[PDB]
Design a protein around this ligand. Structure first.
Ligand SMILES: [Cl-]
Ligand SMILES: [Cl-]
Ligand SMILES: [Cl-]
Ligand SMILES: [Cl-]
Lengths: 462, 462, 462, 462
């Protein structure tokens, strides 16, 4: 069931059905921290597949045999496509440079490429893990490169598409609710009116600004450390490799990847991950506000606010109609709280670089990818399972509109401030409506009230 | 105008009316960071006066002249009593050990004692700042000692008394509201009933647990670093000074101060400050919930929840007689958010100690004292200007109780689940009450409804 | 391959080899957030098994048929023992009350118990998911109970045992290094000496205080919400159930679980999780200091500090001897940064409770369990793979001791301050040792220097 | 002594020498939270003076009397110029909308303009606080406008100029150190060489990227809420006032202020403040790395790293001539930790908006301005008192270069990997240099070593 390999610490049995080698096995034994929920995120593994596929191509310009290079390229493609996920057992909580995952990727790609060429698994023949798969002689620049490839792909494929669906759904609701006038709330107190569409337009602007903030953090993420090698000097790599491998990654992904103008800044720190995490942290604040507002606007049905009727996803009780738990709102606000904590973890790691190398890399990219996946997935779920199905309780909204004390300022240019203040003061102490009190005081007639108190005329400046 | 003093780097103009000296003026010149709001917190200055008073009394056992020592004690008492606050212009953003503030205290106490002994300001005669006020030869242990004295005093005098007032006022409201039954809210949806007194009893328990958590963080605060000198070995200090000066501080303050059992842990880290900030962070989560709940329970008056009538302390618009903004709730929740941020700042500083000395001390104690003062002051303000004056809107609470669909399960044993659920669904569809629907359906009488649906019987287990 | 079940939203195919039902399947479709790394943590599932096993026993006092109860108890045991982990596919990012995992547990236990009694899977006969497995009529108190059971078990079984191993290993190193005098470092500058054992004794005290801080947060974790039902009143549960099920959980686990004195505080907030997260946050600051110190103390071999020789776990290069990357230090400091971020996520969720129910429960317990597992696992790995094998570079330590300028204060009670200051001032500008300069200046002889400059006499007060 | 003013709750004694009125005195009485260090930041007060000056000029287009308007403009100019700071005693911990500070500004400007028009203080004649100074009928939009004006001005005048000085000084050191080759450090272990100029060029890039990130956060800061009035509809304000007052603020400040495109997003949330705090949080991670690196590179002089000689600005002990504590590094890293905590506080406030108004405004702008002032001031102080005066210890750097084992790979093409690794292992075992070992082994001459091992040839790709 196993083959037998050796490192400088002793004998190791590697399962025959695994493409990793003795380096990966030893790493798994030395870092038993967290369990399988702590394995290196799949986007990082796939990004390594893209990077090795790109380097193998470029390395043909530097002596790499085309028959070996093509075998590496096909094996790297299988990694980048998620076909070999079960051959990467390492946890995030490894070395701070992530080079143990780099050696995991080198072992898997060479062994798979060896098998494609009919060789013996574990022999390093004819595809060597270091001499061929890592022909670039890259070391501490590999994992930084895979971090930015994975972050850029996850932002383009998961985060922004999810937020775009949320933006469009909120915008459709805003237009659908454009003519429903409701009582505003400031300090949670009754305030002058606005429409549900105006309130939802604020949500739309927040999501629009969130997508702009995330895009503004991407230019630095597109800068790749590949070519810096050990300390950023580029020692042991070939001239032109840094630019060529970045341009190849750009062509493989369709994203505007470039080489980092300063490789020492690219290895010694990961401020671009901190800035991207900061944009997602701002997005979390926007989504917390939006989801909590809709949570409260749908509260009820009779002892809450009751403005919105949210779609029911979980089965209720036949004895409890009208009760709809805002469960998509709860999942979204929990995600937002998680992103804020993830950002602090990213911040602590990003601040603790030492000299030529920041060695908090796996934890930083884990929290960045975690935040991006959660925000993208929750935005999709929030959209499809709640936002698109939100209905307005227009009957309740219009009833509370006529019973509110907030429309009384519409009578000031008819009966003066103090007569209007006395109608509101009396109606408050009496539990009566504004119209009922304005007539019982003999200040105006009903036909005058309906002519002067028009809420559609209180939605903008004059 | 000025007197002229000298350090070995040149000459310095010291204002004639100031008790600080050349080293303080040199320190102000090199750390122009933040402005006057960033000056060292007054509790730290006062704590230094306590410490120097204690050291001078103890140092008589090791040869300090009694007339010099008694002048130092009187001058240090003036520092501890807050009479010399304008003689400490240094900001928090100084050296990470805080020894520049230690020298500020040495110069002020020496010059003030010189003045009380008829000498000339700045002469170091007959009271020398280092040889007499700092005769203990302490250095890197002075500021840690002053931190823990200041934190313990602020907890004992401000934080815990403020929370005690809040606890007692909430308990009084709980008893006052013990018979007011209202509709519960889970997920912000209508739920089975409970009393306002039961709900408030939850807040009472949170404040009770908050005080227990803060008290649990104090034993390590009471451990003083005084006696560790430069690196924790106690080099250049006298055997027994550490225990004696701690006992003198205990007798002066009435708080159970003892010497730190391990001086290296006391200088290299300030985990006790992190744990105390953590307890205040937990307290902030409690106060955020309590204050936010009261904010929303008082929302309205007509489109909010409207269960509570909060006191109106600042005048509002006469045109708006029903609006009472919960401004005390807003100050409390803003304070809670500030404590959470302050805790992260304490955490980053606490994590970044280097070898024998953590040099983040001034920023750590600044945030700890900030959180304690804000939490204590806000609790007092929230208590006096909101909690004690809260009234229940029993008229609205009773009306919404009768209109709620949540009481329908009381009919289950009398008419069966199927008929009860039919009453609930028809009442929800028609916008009618359970009683109206149950009789229009011929399922029971009005007399059977009044006898079977008793909310006072739905407040506990059977 | 499937059976066919129905909910109120349509037909659902449930795999025959799964014990969950249509409720779990529908929940999996409505909350596609995060992937399989986001599944509910295993300690929560096992804790549900303990809770249901305990309730099934107690419910025999309330009519539950002993033949059904015993079937439930054996099925719950299989859950609590980790035999049915593959039947829980729900993610953390579900409803904020965690009741969808509660229904997942109810479906699995009843279906497995049905199979133990030879029934048809998915029939609810003779073991009903609600009528029998959830006979307590518990709702919003189930997940809070499982949270505290899981947290208490993880602290007792993983966190504290891991820290205890670290404490003992650091203590052994402290005693082993008790006689190795080295130059201290304050502000990273050369300071007066101390021993490696004294420096390591500070680490020991930090870990000891960390275990005390975690234990101090446990009394409130031991309080269980079981019995509060929907809003904390205990409506629909039987008198005495809350106390009995807590005492049964205590007997099943061997831990001092009790019922919560105030069930409204137990449902509306999770301040005990915030306080436990705060204790782990303080522990993270201690471990960050300890691991970073050892990281830097082992730096070198020739351009660093070079005081410690750390064990080599990853294979190096045969051309690069003496290079040992402190990879266990990096994994530990990354874990510490992750705990600090997790604490903020816990803090945000714990602060956002609404009225009768905090609906951030799954996210809060996920981050608490994550922090406890990481700290416990990393402490074990740090201990076994680094601390126990640390060696001291006594040759380098003694060489820098004799070349340091820091021992010059030992000559002040022989030649006075100013003669000693001139030896240090000259030796600094000359690149010479203190003894070489003291003789070249003719201030003392060699035999006098060795008699007066004794570093073993500079390790404590006099 | 005092004058007597009146609100509708009673009478208030206003000090004779103060320009504030009854509403300010009422506000101070009800919010005794924090003390004088907690007063509203001066940049917010000054920004209010700018805003009121702008509104008064624009309001002439809507009928405001020119002589009244010109008196308001002159009084508002005195507020903006910092001449009336002692007339604003309100703390940050007030109402969450900040309207109490808005009224403070209205009363001060009205009373000062009354004084300039010969009237009596407190008379509201001829300049009324609400009818004239607040003629725009703005309310909940005033403080948000003042926040963004204050943040934009502090970024333009303090933060960015401070970072610009730091960038330029670091760039100058990078050029000055361009030929000094030293041993690199990855994982704090000795690594392949690089120049001090290359290492410093990494810091230069981080500061350059920090300024780009902060500038990227400004477009949404430049959007002003002025014109949204109570809920964002703009009710009670004039059409065109929003655009005109923003254009007037732009002309007065020279900054590209525009009106917010969506006033509901502008009042209900302050995500722009969260994004700007995020950029400052990223900057803090950069400065923490830069300052901590320089701290450790200057450590020593004899048991540290010793590569840099930092300037000595405060006198030290003459007995300790080689000790120079990096106090500017400590103030910078303490500031960086404070910014990270401030960011969490901003985040919690930004996430907790309710419906039409976020009522965490004063605490959010307090932390934003605190971070900007500290970062700007510290960057200037760190630049002038440390960076510009840094010297390289080239003697020590060159000695450690020759003693390092990291240059051995330069022998690989000339003698082979196996002999080169033997030289490295023997030099490491003997405590000797590569050159000494290579010749005692008969592997090469001293002349071959000098010609083959050229560190200037190991600073880039081949
Ligand atoms: Cl590569
Ligand atoms: Cl002292
Ligand atoms: Cl149960
Ligand atoms: Cl205005």
């Amino acid at each position: 069931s196993f083959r037998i390999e050796y490192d400088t610490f002793g004998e190791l049995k590697v399962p025959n059905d695994k493409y990793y080698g003795a380096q990966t096995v030893r790493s798994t034994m030395n870092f038993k921290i967290g369990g399988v929920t702590e394995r290196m995120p799949t986007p990082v593994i796939k990004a390594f597949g893209i990077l090795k596929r790109a380097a193998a191509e470029v390395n043909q310009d530097y002596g790499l045999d085309p028959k070996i290079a093509n075998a590496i390229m096909k094996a790297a493609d299988e990694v980048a496509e998620g076909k070999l996920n079960d051959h990467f057992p390492l946890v995030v909580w490894q070395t701070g440079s992530g080079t143990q995952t780099n050696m995991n990727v080198n072992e898997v790609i060479s062994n798979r490429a060896i098998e494609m060429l009919g060789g013996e698994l574990g022999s390093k023949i004819p595809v060597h893990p270091n001499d061929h798969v890592n022909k670039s002689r890259s070391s501490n620049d590999t994992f930084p490169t895979a971090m930015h490839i994975a972050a850029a792909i996850e932002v383009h494929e998961v985060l922004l598409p999810g937020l775009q669906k949320l933006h469009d759904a909120l915008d459709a609701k805003s237009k659908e609710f454009a003519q429903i006038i409701k009582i505003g709330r400031t300090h949670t107190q009754d305030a002058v009116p606005l429409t549900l569409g105006q309130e939802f337009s604020g949500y739309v602007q927040q999501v629009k600004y969130a997508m702009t903030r995330i895009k503004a953090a991407m230019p630095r993420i597109y800068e790749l450390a590949a070519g810096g090698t050990a300390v950023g000097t580029g020692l042991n790599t070939r001239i032109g490799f840094a630019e060529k491998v970045a341009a190849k990654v750009a062509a493989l992904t369709g994203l505007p990847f470039v080489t980092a103008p300063n490789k020492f800044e690219a290895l010694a720190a990961h401020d671009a991950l901190v800035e991207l995490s900061g944009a997602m942290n701002t997005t979390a604040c926007s989504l917390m506000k939006i989801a909590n507002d809709i949570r409260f606007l749908g509260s009820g049905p009779r002892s809450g606010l009751g403005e919105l009727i949210l779609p029911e996803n979980e089965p209720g009780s036949s004895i409890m109609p009208g009760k709809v738990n805002p469960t998509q709102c709860e999942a979204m606000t929990m995600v937002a709280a998680q992103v804020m904590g993830n950002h602090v973890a990213v911040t602590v790691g990003g601040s603790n670089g030492h000299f030529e190398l920041n060695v908090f890399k796996p934890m930083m990219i884990k929290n960045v990818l975690h935040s991006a996946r959660l925000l993208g997935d929750a935005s999709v779920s929030f959209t499809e399972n709640c936002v698109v199905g939100i209905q307005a309780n227009t009957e309740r909204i219009n009833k509370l509109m006529n019973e509110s004390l907030m429309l009384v300022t519409a009578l000031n240019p008819h009966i003066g401030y103090d007569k209007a203040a006395k109608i509101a003061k009396t109606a408050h102490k009496n539990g009566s409506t504004l119209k009922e009190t304005a007539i019982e005081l003999g200040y105006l007639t009903a036909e005058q009230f309906d002519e002067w108190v028009k809420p559609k005329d209180m939605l903008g400046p004059k």
